[PDB]
Amino acid sequence: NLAPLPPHVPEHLVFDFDMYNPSNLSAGVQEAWAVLQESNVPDLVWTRCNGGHWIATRGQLIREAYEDYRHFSSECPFIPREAGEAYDFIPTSMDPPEQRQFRALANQVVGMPVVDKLENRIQELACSLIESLRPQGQCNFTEDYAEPFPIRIFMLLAGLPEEDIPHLKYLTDQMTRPDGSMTFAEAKEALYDYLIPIIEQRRQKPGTDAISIVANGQVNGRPITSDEAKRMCGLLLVGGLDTVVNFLSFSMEFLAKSPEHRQELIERPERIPAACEELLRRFSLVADGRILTSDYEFHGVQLKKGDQILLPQMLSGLDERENACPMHVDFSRQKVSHTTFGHGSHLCLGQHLARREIIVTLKEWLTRIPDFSIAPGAQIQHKSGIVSGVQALPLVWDPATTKAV
Ligand code: HEM
Ligand SMILES: CC1(C)[C@@H]2CC[C@@]1(C)C(=S)C2
């Protein structure tokens, strides 16, 4: 289902990439995207899929576009347009200067100082989940760790019942990796139905949780509105539920396949932080975009007002112009160049949280379960979307090679 080419699009710029179902998905999600970076592909292409939109393919262009909010607006950041249109998260669907006030508040809730305070729980949960798995000699890493670990921490931060996970996780998934079961607006609405009563409750009787702080916050000298609080919280939920979860699975799949990388981390732990960056580069997984505010000629291509453009954060670090041998995992790269957590004014506020969760997992897993692999005859399937993911990750190990702590 290709959309008819608009008049302004030169036929030579056409490359029919489906962000939701790329062609070489079997080879892995990052590799399926990386087709965009082959020599036969222009830097800036138009795809007829998902209603027609531009895609910048090179880290240089992606960064420029991300910097330029005047031309590339966040108003409609999701493809397809109906999703971008329904999209009303804060701060994400706002441009500076307006964005700034909302960002400052979101920052109060997820930033460094929160990470620092939660550090002990993160460590406690990771150790507990791992120890609980260790003697089994097998899990479903996606269901058994990648989900619970980051989610439970978010749940704790947000002061929401663990019981809500399944319902919430379903709705968030619908947003990044649409099933066809529900449209964006429907999904958005169901999440909002969820949050409304809670926000209400927390404006009346505040707690110390993230929702309480957002609901009762100050933006541009006045109080946040209920609707504004709803729209921030909605974003927080998607970030909490859908990011760290998927990343861990890519990373753990790689480690399961690469003894020499595991060993490296076991023997030279000083390297963890560097490896975490390298994994964030190689297993980058986010792709959103912007909307043209006006007619604009960008690197010799004429963009029309209202045109959406995908600026895949995933792609920058995979670009050979940015990193030599991109598909190769090297913990000792002199410079790890990525835009995994975004670029420009929308840089990921939850990054500090994400990094802490990753580093803990690496350290803690490797400590107890140094030797593991993918289950014999399991085929690992990746899934593409706004946030890419791994369907299931069956791991096996010999308990006798594990270490209790
Ligand atoms: C592996 C982990 C994650 C990755 C790769 C990631 C990636 C991103 C990207 C690419 C953006 C910018 C999007 C844009 O420019 O359209 C961003 C923004 C954002 N993310 Fe993260 N994210 C992660 C984890 C999280 C977590 C754990 C949270 C906390 C709930 C979260 C909260 C946010 C917020 C609040 C923003 C918006 C900042 C603003 O618009 O000013 N992220 N994320
Ligand atoms: C990856 C996303 C595009 C999705 C919606 C905003 C975003 C930056 C976070 S955090 C979740």
Structure solved using which method? X-ray
Here the tokens at position 203 are 């404006």
- Check whether 49 is labelled as a binding-site residue: no
- From the list 28, 59, 350, 389, the catalytic residue is 350
Here the tokens at position 377 are 């005859």
Pocket of ligand 2 (CB under 6 A): 92, 235, 238-239, 242-243, 286, 288, 386-387
C-alpha 39: how far from its chain's center? 27
- From the list 139, 157, 285, 349, the catalytic residue is 349
C-alpha 259: how far from its chain's center? 26
The answer to whether residue 349 is catalytic is: yes
Distance CA(319)–CA(337), nearest Å, equals 9
Domain of residue 181, residue span:
1-405
The CATH number of whichever domain residue 164 belongs to comes to: 1.10.630.10
The answer to whether residue 221 is catalytic is: no
Q: How many domains does the chain have?
A: 1
Distance CA(126)–CA(139), nearest Å, equals 15
Q: Which amino acid is at 233?
A: C
Closest atom of ligand 1 relative to the 284 alpha carbon: 5
- From the list 81, 152, 177, 355, the catalytic residue is 177
Cβ of 237 below 6 Å from ligand 1: no
Asked whether the beta carbons of 29 and 287 are under 8 A apart, the reply is no
- Residue 294 burial (C-beta neighbours within 10 Å; 0-12, 13-18, 19+): exposed
Here the tokens at position 343 are 């670029």
Asked whether the beta carbons of 106 and 343 are under 8 A apart, the reply is no
